[PDB]
């Protein structure tokens with residue numbers, strides 16, 4: 001009986017329940033998470049005229065830099081509360097390079113998931129603890145069981161939007177899920193994802209106790225489409241009109257990613273994409289409910305030098321971000337477009 | 347308190363892989379058949395054998411009886427063309443034999459996994475290797491020991507999760523090109539699955555653990571059409587070959603799906619066009635995939651639960667009949683026999 005010939009070995013893994021006790025969620029963290037979901041829900045369903053903003057680092061590899069950023073974003077968040085509902089990007093990784101905070105939390109090319117999950121959860125607690133909601137990519141069917149309670153928003157990356165596995169997973173998450181369009185630039189797959197995630201599914205996951213079980217979902221009605229470019233960009237009126245053209249009756253507000261395929265090989269293009277999105281918003285576009293910005297403390301990205309995490313401070317080690325000030329503007333300018341759009345509807 | 351699982355209606359007890367593997371044990375024959383299939387598949391996709399790897403069979407199995415009759419027929423034909431073709435049966439698992447084993451929206455996974463495994467044992471038991479789609483990251487743990495070939499479908503080839511899974515399977519894995527007709531994603535999948543990965547899967551005992559893979563060097567690309575159009579023609583094969591990196595394995599061409607272009611009657615055609623590239627010396631094509639069954643076409647699921655279903659007819663994709671299949675395979679058989687001459 002030939003089995004596991006390509007499996008070098010298994011390693012003990014702390015269960016979700018165990019991790020949730022080790023690194024408990026403060027009452028604030030749990031309240032922050034609930035609030036974020038409520039606000040996000042109202043915005044993508046049309047009940048609120050504010051714009052949902054998922055902004056923050058491409059990926060977090062430094063909890064101390066992520067905390068400084070959170071404080072800054074929490075303040076700005078306080079000044080633009082009337083127009084913008086801001087959620088922080090607390091992403092673990094990118095698509096060859098650094099494997100992410102869960103796999104390689106030490107950023108030294110060593111794998112250590114147990115410590116990774118600890119960092120991941122501690123991070124989420126630290127952030128939501130200061131009152132700042134967070135969003136992350138739903139990488140797999142197990143990992144969310146360690147962090148789902150502190151998350152207000154979940155995104156299903158372009159490479160997995162067609163994955164039956166990720167559609168079933170979304171149908172059972174306790175928060176809004178954004179499905180990015182295909183890497184080939186089409187929306188059909190993201191529209192189908194939302195339809196599917198709305199139904200009830202029966203899949204196999206692990207319980208809070210680390211055991212495999214047959215899960216049964218309720219269906220998620222808070223799934224929307226995210227426009228992020230592809231084989232070209234799609235944040236322009238002509239493209240948005242084609243998108244709207246594809247959403248079924250009742251579909252939720254579109255979200256737009258200023259990066260990746262939309263800034264096509266350059267973070268400097270994020271502010272430009274903001275103008276082209278702010279325009280449509282001020283002129284009265286109601287289908288654009290949310291935006292996604294990859295910003296950091298200091299612009300650009302970088303690589304890991306000979307040594308590990310000691311590396312330019314506040315600088316992404318994956319996709320390049322825009323600096324902070326460039327972010328202050330981009331958001332104040334988006335808040336304006338929100339107000340100006342508030343009038344056109346009156 | 348907190349607010350998790352608000353969309354989780356509930357969990358259900360699930361027999362562990364180890365438990366299932368004892369309940370429905372694999373006969374020595376089943377285990378030998380599985381090993382043989384992998385060896386033959388490996389030799390063919392790596393260039394060591396001039397035969398053509400053939401993954402043929404139903405689009406999906408919903409009837410173990412009908413699947414067994416078909417297996418016997420295919421086993422007898424497989425015995426005859428064993429000199430030119432290495433046949434592995436399509437035994438892919440409406441959600442599937444696993445989610446709805448009874449076919450009536452009553453999702454009984456435990457029974458589904460039993461049927462799934464019993465089926466795999468029944469088939470491999472008569473000496474016929476089998477192949478299936480690597481659905482999720484847990485399911486295989488209940489059937490790997492019986493599988494000779496695993497395919498990742500178009501909608502998952504880009505999934506990091508499925509690339510890591512392939513890197514730890516004990517058999518060759520075929521990655522289908524994107525639903526948009528491109529091969530870049532399938533080529534990247536093969537590159538990725540060749541490396542070692544660290545993911546979370548469940549053990550034979552139903553517990554979550556950190557898995558570490560060795561890397562799989564037996565991953566190839568499957569051409570199955572797409573938006574950009576069908577791709578079984580020589581110019582497509584050629585453009586494909588030009589994109590294959592150093593050390594890639596032999597290409598496989600799916601006759602149905604995006605290449606049959608919504609009409610199963612086009613499979614015999616793709617064959618001919620592909621059989622011609624082979625009979626003239628094309629060695630880049632080492633495998634073919636065919637959605638076949640006892641009776642051509644497909645159907646739906648009547649209010650009459652399931653016992654009101656046409657026998658030997660697919661309840662998913664349309665397939666060609668046994669009759670029409672035995673040709674395709676005989677022509678393909680010959681196309682190979684020819685190739686060996688052109689290379690002689």
Ligand SMILES: N[C@@H](Cc1ccccc1)C(=O)O
Nearest residue numbers: 003004486487490515516547
């Ligand atoms: N046991 C599988 C590998 C595997 C391990 C863990 C999870 C899923 C699959 C095989 O022999 O191919």
Ligand SMILES: [Mn+2]
Nearest residue numbers: 058094294319
């Ligand atoms: Mn990024």
Ligand SMILES: [Mn+2]
Nearest residue numbers: 405603637663
């Ligand atoms: Mn099919």
